[PDB]
Amino acid sequence: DIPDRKEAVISLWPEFAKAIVSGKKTVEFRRRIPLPALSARIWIYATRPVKSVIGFAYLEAIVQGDVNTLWSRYGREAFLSEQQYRDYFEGTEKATAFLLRDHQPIRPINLDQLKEIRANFQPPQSLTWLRKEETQKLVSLTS
Ligand SMILES: [Cl-]
Ligand SMILES: [Cl-]
């Protein structure tokens, strides 16, 4: 029984995780990774020291294309220096741009609660898809 990928979790360092949930960062760049559904809700897991899901946002678009064109068009909305961007994309010619909308902060759901939802949860290297019963438990914890 395969997840539909309309619900996914992504990991960011806490300054960037907070920028997405506050609506300051509306673009997240990644390499060519397996993609979520276009209508997905993306729950934002902040890594140490926060180690918590701190909110979510939705996708208005997924863009893939040349690394230079993605920087020129969307880099201003991504909250990262051009240097951090060039360093992350060294070694590939193409990138993914996740364009986000409708960000929502929540009271943080810590890693102990997350392991109560999925026993071996650990922060994803890219995306992880939530199963429907996992999603029902996470929505139940939201404030
Ligand atoms: Cl990667
Ligand atoms: Cl670890």
Author numbering: 3 to 145
Paper passage:
In vitro assays showed that ZmASCH bound nucleic acids and possessed cleavage activity specifically towards single-stranded RNAs.
There are two and four protein molecules in the asymmetric unit of the trigonal and monoclinic crystal forms, respectively. The conformations of individual monomers are in excellent agreement, and all monomers superimpose with RMSD values of less than 0.3 Å, with the largest deviations in the loops between strands β2 and β3 and helices α4 and α5. A deep pocket exhibiting a positively-charged protein surface is formed between helices α1, α3 and the central β-barrel. The methylated base is trapped in the hydrophobic pocket on the surface cleft, where aromatic residues of proteins interact with a methyl moiety on the base at one side or both sides.
